[PDB]
């Protein structure tokens with residue numbers, strides 16, 4: 413059973429409206445499903461959008477933010493809870509402690525570093541929580557091509573690759589995450 | 595001036611000999627250039643290969659390894675120094691403290707998480723040390739395609755993208771790293 417889902421997403425909104433539409437769909441879907449949203453606690457970009465959609469639909473939202481970037485990404489004032497921690501490592505360790513699964517929406521280097529960090533923690537045996545990509549147009553196509561290449565070239569085992577699910581529908585991706593097994 | 599270079603690379607050797615050839619070329623080139631190699635301190639895979647090539651050519655090598663994975667990746671016994679630290683975060687923080695620049699050889703999820711983590715630290719203003727991709731065949735082509743897309747879609751600023759240089763020649767990449775500017 414999933415009870416809460418951690419979402420990583422851009423602090424920018426992105427160059428076209430499709431990104432915000434995907435964030436809205438996902439926030440709304442999490443709430444409708446009974447799941448708590450865990451996220452970086454910002455009000456900027458897709459972070460703000462996914463929290464707002466979760467809240468508009470009645471969902472619980474917990475934001476996790478380092479002290480050092482409260483003003484930069486604008487700590488969201490209308491969350492169920494906003495947890496302010498000591499630094500970047502603490503933030504990711506806490507989001508993981510509260511989540512049953514992880515979803516990456518489109519984002520930048522921060523979204524990607526979070527995804528990869530948490531993926532390695534599964535690789536190293538610290539958790540067995542599944543990760544997912546919410547696909548928006550062909551945003552992630554070249555990343556998936558690259559990750560599959562890592563398995564062909566034998567830098568990543570198949571079972572480690574298989575921790576990352578993917579879907580363009582929030583419902584179908586959440587189903588894949590809820591059913592996935594080590 | 596570069597005095598020391600941190601290398602991230604696979605703990606696997608990879609499915610074909612080209613990867614080991616690139617690691618050998620890079621280790622040998624670092625040593626010939628007078629640069630200290632900083633790396634994860636393993637004797638497995640491309641990690642072992644790049645340290646051995648640096649050492650065979652007379653270079654200094656410093657390995658940085660968490661306590662918890664000494665047996666797993668085989669702490670290298672013939673380094674200038676092997677520093678054993680408390681955990682994963684400590685390892686990356688220490689490699690960064692000792693390096694003037696970062697190079698990613700081909701690798702898996704660990705190589706990628708390290709690259710992305712250190713890249714964000716530049717993004718957040720903690721350092722201004724350049725990063726580089728050593729290109730081996732078209733290994734990184736789809737990653738570069740994806741990263742460029744992040745800038746087109748406005749999830750990453752151009753100046754943040756520009757912290758990552760790239761080359762197939764160790765000499766040309768090291769020149770790009772030594773000359774790069776914020």
Ligand SMILES: Nc1ncnc2c1ncn2[C@@H]1O[C@H](COP(=O)(O)O)[C@@H](O)[C@H]1O
Nearest residue numbers: 421422423424500519520521522523714
């Ligand atoms: N090393 C890191 N650890 C934790 N959070 C980070 C790190 N780097 C960036 N972030 C955050 O991730 C969020 C999403 O980043 P981005 O996808 O680059 O817009 C940013 O607002 C950053 O504050």
Ligand SMILES: Nc1ncnc2c1ncn2[C@@H]1O[C@H](COP(=O)(O)O)[C@@H](O)[C@H]1O
Nearest residue numbers: 532603604605606682701702703704705
């Ligand atoms: N989160 C992490 N922090 C530091 N090192 C890591 C992490 N995940 C994996 N590694 C290391 O990076 C090395 C290269 O990994 P790979 O590229 O997956 O073969 C591995 O041997 C791991 O011990």
